[PDB]
Amino acid sequence: MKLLHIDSSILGDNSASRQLSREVVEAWKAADPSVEVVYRDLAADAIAHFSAATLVAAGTPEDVRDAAQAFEAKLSAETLEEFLAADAVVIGAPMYNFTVPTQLKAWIDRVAVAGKTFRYTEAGPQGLCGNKKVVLVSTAGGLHAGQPTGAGHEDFLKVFLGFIGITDLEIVRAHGLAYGPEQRSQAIDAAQAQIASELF
């Protein structure tokens, strides 16, 4: 099966979600040696803001697209197709300013596509990604889970994933990381424990 490994942290080697997302994937490889991993670092290779140009490019035939529109169209196509081909997705999702990084949301904007990841039915709109397994690696300085302050982070992500039909979702959480090295260490230790004995 195909595992899509997504990171969105801007903290490089000091990143919590990058460490944990890699550990999830390594554990996954161990449990299933046949898994084929595809990596996308949304911070190192940032996806352009979903723009008016993104919309225009989509509604313009290839033969008449200019260079900028070919860029947008290809960016949209390769991101979407990469996601569609994935059977499992591990997503590094830090909380920056009470929500996900724009680098991650820009990716969401490219994978939320009518007729592909969800569809509008005379009955309403249904997700088409029910076969995909998602492991969300959620990291935050404070402790916001289950509180109103967590709305733009995990609550939002659960909403979007639910919309495109994800039912098989696990959340590997390491929060309260801002509260000092001991709280940070335990938060990560607990996340690692979850990975080792509660995922596979």
Next chain:
Amino acid sequence: MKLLHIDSSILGDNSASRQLSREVVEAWKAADPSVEVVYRDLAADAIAHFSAATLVAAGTPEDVRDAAQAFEAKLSAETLEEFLAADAVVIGAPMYNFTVPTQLKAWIDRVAVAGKTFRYTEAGPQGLCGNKKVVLVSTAGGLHAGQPTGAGHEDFLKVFLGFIGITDLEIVRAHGLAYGPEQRSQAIDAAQAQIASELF
């Protein structure tokens, strides 16, 4: 007083939030002819993703910054200073894929600055923008207000604004815009009514 008028819609002339945000501001001008308006179209002039480079640039002295770092540093400085100088802010905030546009979040990333719009106290973190009045122009295809699906949109915005200490907040809402021209018309009519007789 200084009114900062922010738009983030990518729909140009077909934009609901652009129409309503302009109408809020025009009404404000009418009620207070001395108001000085500053406009920033976050879609037309998109702010770069808050990146590792944004962080590095901040921690590098001007005399040793390269061109890219001067760009990031200036972008951070001019956005923040523009917000700090504003006494009132009108914000156009569409829901794109269950949250705000990345164009708007990228702006949030530049105005959320420790020691400037909030601060960390031995007692915890307090907003410093209590003197600013905010009018949020909230537009959405569906009806999500007060529902879990609204978490990444209005709930998130209320969280962020609260964090930086905004207490004087009004929300001009036009939702259910996807439900056809009649529902769309009334939603906007009601928003206009609010503007005309419930703001000033």
